[PDB]
Amino acid sequence: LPICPGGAARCQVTLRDLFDRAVVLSHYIHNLSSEMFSEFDKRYTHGRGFITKAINSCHTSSLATPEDKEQAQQMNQKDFLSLIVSILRSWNEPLYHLVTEVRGMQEAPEAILSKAVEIEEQTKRLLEGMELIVSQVHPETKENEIYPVWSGLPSLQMADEESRLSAYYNLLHCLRRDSHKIDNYLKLLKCRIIHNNNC
């Protein structure tokens, strides 16, 4: 039978194809959060002396994510698919503010904005790759897209460089580690998604 009868805008998609793109797409955000934050850390917090505190609030940490690889094996449930959606959506808002404040930042107008505008867009792409993957791996899932909330950056007019820096230091830094976590799950899921030998 024809792969795509006539011409459907939706047409059919191979779970492996989108999953493979979603697995690699997660690495792209890693570079964005890594370089986008590093360009900021070395620009506004260049050896500031106060950003050396081990700070990793990570609002998504509250999500029921796997504590370690051993627990992830113990999980083996739809929670993995739900956790990815919660993490990617949780950063959809925080990235919006980073782009708005950076857009008006004379010190960071297009430099950091270039990564901030593309980092918020790729994060949503993983969402679609995941929503079809979760809907294909677990057809029972009707529409699961619950994510944490946001309680940081109460006011973005903080002109203080030391205070405002914390505003993005907490977000951009956790944005990187979390982007890796979202990327890590696609790698583990690959083991039972396309090839038994992987991860």
Swiss-Prot record:
Keywords tagged on the record: Disulfide bond, Glycoprotein, Hormone, Lactation, Phosphoprotein, Secreted, Signal
Segments passing through the bilayer: none
UniProt keyword Signal, yes or no: yes
Primary subcellular site in the record, as a coarse category: secreted
GO cellular component: endosome lumen; extracellular region; extracellular space
Residues bearing PTM Phosphoserine: 26, 34, 90, 135, 166
Keyword Secreted: yes
GO biological process: cell surface receptor signaling pathway; female pregnancy; lactation; mammary gland development; negative regulation of angiogenesis; negative regulation of endothelial cell proliferation; positive regulation of canonical NF-kappaB signal transduction; positive regulation of lactation
Known glycosylation sites: 31
Subcellular compartments: Secreted
GO molecular function list: hormone activity; prolactin receptor binding
Disulphide-bonded residues: 4-11, 58-174, 191-199
Family of the protein in this entry: Belongs to the somatotropin/prolactin family.
Protein task: Prolactin acts primarily on the mammary gland by promoting lactation.
Subunit details: Interacts with PRLR.
Name of the protein this chain belongs to: Prolactin
Native source organism of the sequence: Homo sapiens
Source lineage: Eukaryota, Metazoa, Chordata, Craniata, Vertebrata
